[PDB]
Design a protein. Structure first.
Length: 130
């Protein structure tokens, strides 16, 4: 309905604001754009389902997220991809893993503090009804 499309619009507005706050954080710059095959060639050998914050923005605008759970699944994918591609004790690996976990923890903390749980429930019930 009209009421339901207004609900999903507010969700998109909220998700755009969270994603922008993540994307401008210096720690998360490595997660802001897809991985250039020129710069690292073996990424596709390890990571079957790439994800990054620019792609999250595009998915928001394509109405791909109808719940915050759907969005958080892509945030979690960014993080688990980073952990999987950087398993070594190497300090470069450990640094990216630390930033990956910080990215995930920061997104969950913002949503826990700022997203009303009745709003997320409404989104879920609209989605369940389709
Ligand atoms: C998406 C992802 O997880 C990813 N992981 C990578 N891991 C590495 O490059 C590991 C490999 N082992 C040795 C150490 N090295 C890391 C060194 C050094 C750490 C600080 C730094 F700022 F991160 C820059 C890299 S590169 C990479 C990626 C690549 N091209 C574009 C994008 N957007 C992300």
């Amino acid at each position: 309905s009209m009421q339901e499309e207004d609900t999903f619009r507010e969700l998109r507005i909220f998700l755009r604001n969270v994603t922008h706050r993540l994307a401008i954080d210096k720690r998360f710059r490595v997660f802001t754009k897809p991985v250039d095959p020129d710069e690292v060639p073996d990424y596709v050998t390890v990571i079957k389902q790439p994800m990054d914050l620019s792609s999250v923005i595009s998915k928001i605008d394509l109405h791909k997220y109808l719940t915050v759970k759907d969005y958080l699944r892509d945030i979690d994918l960014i993080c688990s991809n980073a952990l999987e591609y950087n398993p070594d004790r190497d300090p470069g690996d450990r640094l990216i893993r630390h930033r990956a976990c910080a990215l995930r923890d920061t997104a969950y903390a913002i949503i826990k503090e700022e997203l009303d749980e009745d709003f997320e429930q409404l989104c879920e019930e609209i989605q369940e009804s389709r």
